[PDB]
Coordinates of C-alpha atoms in Angstrom, one line a residue:
Chain A
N10 CA -29.3 13.9 -76.9
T11 CA -26.5 12.9 -74.5
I12 CA -23.6 15.4 -74.3
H13 CA -24.6 16.5 -70.8
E14 CA -23.9 12.9 -69.6
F15 CA -20.1 13.1 -70.1
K16 CA -17.6 14.6 -67.7
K17 CA -16.3 17.7 -69.6
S18 CA -12.8 19.1 -69.5
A19 CA -12.3 22.3 -71.5
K20 CA -9.3 23.3 -73.6
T21 CA -8.1 19.7 -73.4
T22 CA -7.3 16.8 -75.7
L23 CA -5.5 13.5 -75.2
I24 CA -2.3 12.3 -77.0
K25 CA -1.2 8.6 -77.3
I26 CA 2.1 7.7 -75.8
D27 CA 1.8 4.0 -76.9
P28 CA 1.3 4.2 -80.7
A29 CA -0.7 0.9 -80.7
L30 CA -3.9 2.5 -79.2
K31 CA -6.8 3.1 -81.5
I32 CA -8.4 6.4 -82.5
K33 CA -11.2 7.3 -84.9
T34 CA -11.7 10.7 -86.2
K35 CA -14.4 12.3 -88.4
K36 CA -15.3 15.8 -89.6
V37 CA -18.6 16.8 -87.9
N38 CA -20.7 19.9 -87.3
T39 CA -21.3 19.9 -83.5
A40 CA -20.0 18.3 -80.3
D41 CA -23.3 16.6 -79.6
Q42 CA -22.8 14.5 -82.8
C43 CA -19.6 13.2 -81.2
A44 CA -21.6 12.5 -78.0
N45 CA -24.4 10.7 -79.8
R46 CA -22.0 8.4 -81.6
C47 CA -20.1 7.7 -78.4
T48 CA -23.2 6.8 -76.3
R49 CA -24.5 4.6 -79.1
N50 CA -21.0 3.3 -80.1
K51 CA -22.1 3.0 -83.7
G52 CA -19.4 2.3 -86.3
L53 CA -16.6 2.4 -83.7
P54 CA -14.1 -0.5 -83.8
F55 CA -13.8 -0.3 -80.0
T56 CA -15.6 0.7 -76.7
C57 CA -15.9 4.5 -76.7
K58 CA -14.6 5.7 -73.3
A59 CA -14.1 9.4 -74.2
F60 CA -14.1 11.8 -77.1
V61 CA -12.7 15.1 -78.1
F62 CA -14.4 17.8 -80.2
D63 CA -12.0 20.0 -82.1
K64 CA -13.6 23.4 -82.6
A65 CA -10.8 24.4 -85.1
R66 CA -10.6 21.3 -87.3
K67 CA -14.4 20.7 -86.8
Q68 CA -13.8 17.0 -85.9
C69 CA -14.7 14.3 -83.3
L70 CA -11.9 12.1 -82.1
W71 CA -13.3 8.9 -80.3
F72 CA -11.0 7.1 -77.9
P73 CA -11.0 3.6 -76.3
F74 CA -9.3 5.2 -73.3
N75 CA -9.5 8.2 -71.1
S76 CA -7.4 10.8 -69.2
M77 CA -6.6 8.2 -66.5
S78 CA -5.5 5.4 -69.0
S79 CA -1.8 4.4 -69.0
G80 CA 0.2 5.6 -72.0
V81 CA -2.0 8.7 -72.6
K82 CA -1.2 12.3 -71.7
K83 CA -3.3 15.4 -71.6
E84 CA -2.5 18.2 -74.1
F85 CA -3.7 21.8 -73.8
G86 CA -5.4 23.4 -76.8
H87 CA -8.0 26.3 -77.0
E88 CA -9.7 24.4 -79.8
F89 CA -10.3 21.2 -77.9
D90 CA -13.0 20.0 -75.4
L91 CA -12.7 16.6 -73.8
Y92 CA -15.6 14.5 -72.8
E93 CA -15.2 11.3 -70.7
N94 CA -17.9 8.6 -70.4
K95 CA -18.8 8.2 -66.7
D96 CA -19.0 4.4 -67.1
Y97 CA -15.3 4.5 -67.4
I98 CA -14.6 6.9 -64.5
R99 CA -14.2 4.7 -61.4
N100 CA -17.3 5.5 -59.3
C101 CA -16.1 4.1 -56.0
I102 CA -13.3 5.1 -53.7
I103 CA -10.0 3.5 -52.9
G104 CA -8.9 4.2 -49.3
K105 CA -9.6 7.9 -48.3
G106 CA -10.4 8.6 -52.0
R107 CA -7.5 10.9 -52.8
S108 CA -7.6 9.8 -56.4
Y109 CA -11.4 10.1 -56.7
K110 CA -12.3 11.7 -60.1
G111 CA -16.0 10.9 -60.3
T112 CA -18.8 13.4 -60.7
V113 CA -20.9 13.0 -57.5
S114 CA -21.6 16.6 -56.4
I115 CA -24.0 16.2 -53.5
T116 CA -23.2 15.8 -49.8
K117 CA -24.4 13.0 -47.5
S118 CA -27.5 15.0 -46.3
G119 CA -28.4 16.0 -49.9
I120 CA -26.9 19.4 -50.3
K121 CA -25.7 20.5 -53.7
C122 CA -22.0 21.2 -53.5
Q123 CA -20.5 24.7 -53.9
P124 CA -18.1 25.1 -56.9
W125 CA -14.4 25.0 -55.9
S126 CA -13.9 28.2 -58.0
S127 CA -16.5 30.1 -55.9
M128 CA -16.4 31.9 -52.6
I129 CA -20.2 31.8 -52.3
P130 CA -21.6 31.0 -49.9
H131 CA -18.4 29.9 -48.2
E132 CA -15.0 31.5 -48.4
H133 CA -12.1 29.1 -48.5
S134 CA -8.5 28.4 -49.7
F135 CA -9.0 25.3 -51.8
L136 CA -8.5 27.1 -55.1
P137 CA -8.0 24.6 -58.0
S138 CA -4.8 26.4 -58.9
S139 CA -3.1 25.5 -55.6
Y140 CA -4.3 21.9 -56.0
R141 CA -3.3 20.7 -59.5
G142 CA -3.7 17.0 -59.8
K143 CA -6.6 17.0 -57.3
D144 CA -9.3 17.8 -60.1
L145 CA -11.1 20.5 -58.1
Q146 CA -13.4 21.1 -61.0
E147 CA -16.9 22.2 -61.0
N148 CA -18.5 21.3 -57.7
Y149 CA -17.3 17.7 -57.4
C150 CA -16.9 15.9 -54.1
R151 CA -13.1 15.7 -53.5
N152 CA -10.6 14.9 -50.8
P153 CA -7.7 17.1 -52.0
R154 CA -5.7 16.7 -48.8
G155 CA -6.3 12.9 -48.4
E156 CA -8.0 13.3 -45.1
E157 CA -9.8 10.8 -42.9
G158 CA -13.4 11.3 -43.9
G159 CA -13.2 10.7 -47.7
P160 CA -14.4 13.1 -50.5
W161 CA -16.3 16.2 -49.3
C162 CA -17.3 19.6 -50.6
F163 CA -18.1 23.2 -49.5
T164 CA -21.9 23.3 -49.4
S165 CA -24.3 25.7 -51.1
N166 CA -26.3 26.0 -47.9
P167 CA -24.9 29.1 -46.2
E168 CA -25.6 27.3 -42.9
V169 CA -23.5 24.2 -43.7
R170 CA -19.9 25.2 -44.5
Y171 CA -18.9 21.7 -45.7
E172 CA -20.0 18.1 -45.5
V173 CA -18.7 14.7 -46.5
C174 CA -20.2 13.0 -49.6
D175 CA -21.4 9.5 -49.4
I176 CA -19.3 7.6 -51.9
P177 CA -19.0 3.8 -51.6
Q178 CA -15.6 2.1 -51.0
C179 CA -14.7 -0.1 -54.1
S180 CA -13.8 -3.1 -52.0
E181 CA -14.4 -3.6 -48.2
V182 CA -15.1 -7.0 -46.8
Chain B
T11 CA -33.7 11.3 -67.0
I12 CA -34.9 7.7 -66.4
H13 CA -32.1 6.5 -68.7
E14 CA -29.6 7.3 -66.0
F15 CA -30.9 4.4 -64.0
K16 CA -30.7 0.6 -64.2
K17 CA -34.2 -0.9 -63.8
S18 CA -34.9 -4.2 -62.0
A19 CA -38.5 -5.2 -62.7
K20 CA -40.8 -6.6 -60.0
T21 CA -38.3 -5.6 -57.4
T22 CA -38.3 -3.5 -54.3
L23 CA -36.0 -2.8 -51.4
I24 CA -36.6 -3.0 -47.6
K25 CA -34.5 -1.5 -44.8
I26 CA -33.4 -4.0 -42.1
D27 CA -31.6 -1.0 -40.6
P28 CA -34.6 1.2 -39.6
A29 CA -32.3 4.3 -39.1
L30 CA -31.8 4.7 -42.9
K31 CA -33.8 7.6 -44.4
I32 CA -36.7 7.1 -46.8
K33 CA -39.0 9.6 -48.6
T34 CA -42.2 8.8 -50.4
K35 CA -44.7 10.7 -52.5
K36 CA -47.7 10.0 -54.8
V37 CA -46.7 11.0 -58.3
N38 CA -48.0 10.1 -61.8
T39 CA -45.2 8.3 -63.6
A40 CA -41.8 6.6 -62.9
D41 CA -40.3 9.4 -65.0
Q42 CA -41.3 11.9 -62.2
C43 CA -39.5 9.9 -59.5
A44 CA -36.3 9.8 -61.7
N45 CA -36.5 13.5 -62.2
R46 CA -36.7 14.2 -58.5
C47 CA -33.9 11.7 -57.8
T48 CA -31.5 13.0 -60.4
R49 CA -32.1 16.7 -59.3
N50 CA -32.0 15.5 -55.7
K51 CA -34.1 18.4 -54.8
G52 CA -35.9 18.4 -51.4
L53 CA -34.4 15.0 -50.4
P54 CA -32.6 15.1 -47.1
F55 CA -30.0 12.5 -48.3
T56 CA -28.1 11.6 -51.5
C57 CA -30.5 9.7 -53.8
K58 CA -29.0 6.4 -55.1
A59 CA -32.2 4.5 -56.1
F60 CA -35.9 4.7 -56.0
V61 CA -38.8 2.4 -56.4
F62 CA -42.0 3.2 -58.3
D63 CA -45.0 1.5 -56.8
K64 CA -47.1 1.2 -60.0
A65 CA -50.2 0.4 -58.0
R66 CA -50.3 3.4 -55.6
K67 CA -48.4 5.5 -58.2
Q68 CA -45.9 6.4 -55.4
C69 CA -42.1 7.0 -55.5
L70 CA -40.0 5.8 -52.7
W71 CA -36.5 7.5 -52.9
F72 CA -33.6 5.9 -51.0
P73 CA -30.0 6.8 -50.0
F74 CA -29.1 3.1 -50.7
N75 CA -29.4 0.5 -53.5
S76 CA -29.4 -3.3 -53.7
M77 CA -25.7 -3.6 -52.8
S78 CA -26.0 -1.5 -49.6
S79 CA -25.9 -3.0 -46.1
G80 CA -29.0 -2.5 -43.9
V81 CA -31.2 -3.4 -46.9
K82 CA -32.8 -6.4 -48.6
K83 CA -34.1 -7.0 -52.1
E84 CA -37.6 -8.4 -52.6
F85 CA -40.0 -9.6 -55.4
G86 CA -43.3 -7.8 -55.8
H87 CA -45.2 -7.4 -59.1
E88 CA -46.3 -3.7 -58.5
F89 CA -42.8 -2.5 -58.0
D90 CA -39.9 -1.4 -60.3
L91 CA -36.5 -0.7 -58.9
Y92 CA -34.3 2.0 -60.5
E93 CA -30.7 2.3 -59.4
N94 CA -28.6 5.4 -60.2
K95 CA -25.6 4.2 -62.3
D96 CA -23.2 6.4 -60.2
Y97 CA -23.6 4.1 -57.3
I98 CA -23.3 0.8 -59.1
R99 CA -19.7 -0.2 -59.1
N100 CA -18.4 0.4 -62.6
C101 CA -15.0 -1.4 -62.2
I102 CA -14.4 -5.1 -61.7
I103 CA -12.5 -7.1 -59.2
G104 CA -10.6 -9.8 -61.0
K105 CA -12.9 -12.1 -63.0
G106 CA -15.8 -9.8 -62.2
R107 CA -18.1 -12.4 -60.8
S108 CA -20.2 -9.7 -59.2
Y109 CA -20.3 -7.1 -61.9
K110 CA -23.9 -5.6 -62.1
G111 CA -23.2 -2.5 -64.2
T112 CA -24.9 -1.5 -67.4
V113 CA -22.1 -1.7 -70.1
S114 CA -23.7 -3.5 -73.1
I115 CA -21.0 -3.0 -75.8
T116 CA -18.2 -5.4 -76.5
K117 CA -14.5 -4.8 -76.7
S118 CA -14.7 -4.4 -80.5
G119 CA -17.7 -2.0 -80.2
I120 CA -20.6 -4.3 -80.9
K121 CA -24.1 -3.9 -79.3
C122 CA -24.8 -6.9 -77.1
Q123 CA -27.6 -9.3 -77.9
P124 CA -30.2 -9.4 -75.1
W125 CA -29.9 -12.5 -72.9
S126 CA -33.6 -13.0 -73.6
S127 CA -33.3 -13.0 -77.4
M128 CA -32.2 -16.0 -79.5
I129 CA -31.4 -13.8 -82.6
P130 CA -28.9 -14.0 -84.0
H131 CA -27.6 -16.5 -81.4
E132 CA -29.2 -19.4 -79.7
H133 CA -27.8 -20.3 -76.3
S134 CA -28.4 -21.9 -72.9
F135 CA -28.0 -18.7 -70.7
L136 CA -31.6 -17.9 -70.0
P137 CA -32.1 -15.7 -66.9
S138 CA -34.1 -18.4 -65.1
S139 CA -31.3 -20.9 -64.5
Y140 CA -28.8 -18.3 -63.5
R141 CA -30.7 -16.7 -60.6
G142 CA -28.9 -13.8 -58.9
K143 CA -26.6 -13.3 -61.9
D144 CA -28.7 -10.3 -63.3
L145 CA -28.9 -11.6 -66.9
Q146 CA -31.2 -8.8 -67.9
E147 CA -31.5 -6.6 -71.1
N148 CA -28.1 -6.9 -72.9
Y149 CA -25.7 -6.1 -70.1
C150 CA -22.1 -7.5 -70.1
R151 CA -22.1 -10.3 -67.5
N152 CA -19.9 -13.1 -66.1
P153 CA -22.7 -15.5 -64.8
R154 CA -20.4 -18.5 -64.3
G155 CA -17.7 -16.3 -62.7
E156 CA -15.1 -17.6 -65.2
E157 CA -11.7 -16.5 -66.4
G158 CA -12.1 -13.7 -69.0
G159 CA -14.5 -11.4 -67.2
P160 CA -17.8 -10.1 -68.2
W161 CA -19.1 -10.8 -71.7
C162 CA -22.3 -11.0 -73.9
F163 CA -23.7 -12.6 -77.1
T164 CA -23.3 -10.1 -79.9
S165 CA -25.8 -8.4 -82.2
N166 CA -23.5 -9.2 -85.1
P167 CA -24.3 -12.6 -86.6
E168 CA -20.7 -12.9 -87.7
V169 CA -19.7 -12.7 -84.0
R170 CA -21.5 -15.0 -81.6
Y171 CA -20.0 -13.5 -78.4
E172 CA -17.2 -11.2 -77.2
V173 CA -15.8 -10.0 -73.8
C174 CA -16.5 -6.6 -72.6
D175 CA -13.8 -4.1 -71.9
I176 CA -14.6 -3.2 -68.2
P177 CA -11.6 -1.8 -66.3
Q178 CA -10.2 -3.5 -63.2
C179 CA -10.8 -1.5 -60.0
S180 CA -6.9 -1.7 -59.6
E181 CA -6.2 -0.2 -63.0
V182 CA -6.1 3.4 -61.9
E183 CA -4.2 5.2 -59.1

């Protein structure tokens, strides 16, 4: 049982710009069936990097690409949930990590991050809506303003307003 | 929760930088270390790896893994090292000589044959002669650091070997 291991984006699917890209679809009962088949990669003619579960058409769509792939666009739909395989979400930071999209959600001293959508325990102005493109989803460590210090979060310790998260540089020699 | 880690058998880590935090505790099973590490509860740092000392039944949790500076790998038959996937670089630089992630499915979606197995393919890439190259389990690897990037022998008899589809670190923003 693996659905909890994917990065979820609600009300979202992906569309192919380039018509050469593969897609596999199958009518299914539940989203965890899409997850199981992706994790296990059984009967997929490609490496499964993400999948969509269509609650209206009751299908899985498995993709050899994700929301960050070139030639793919997001599409909004109430019926769709998107799930991206963490192994294909870059888990290291380039520069200050403005483009960080990973799912680390704990600060350097081990504090679970506060959700961006919450004002508890800390009140703040980094509402997701004011920062489209910065993926201020859930409680992920982010660096929305591209600041020296790298990805950070408001902290769920009322004593510690915010702290940096300890995410490794992809390449530093 | 133990599945979220890559295991290196007979391996522990030692801090050369004595400032780096550690936390230990007698436990019953390696599963219980993994649980605490994933949940990160009551750890005054971000947990990236732990060692289970199978002799003393003790966990050692760490804010570093084998790729970190200030630390050194070591053989030792009572130890197992478990590294949290989120801190093992999951993109490659060029030919990917140094790729140590856990992707074990080929471009066309085929489960890799373990480096240790000779079914369905016999070969001369036994772990022993490629020391340091991490030819363990059925992970995509580039032991000889050659053009083409990481690959594996395939569980499909029809298909001896195939490259893996691991993204370049430069692929995305």
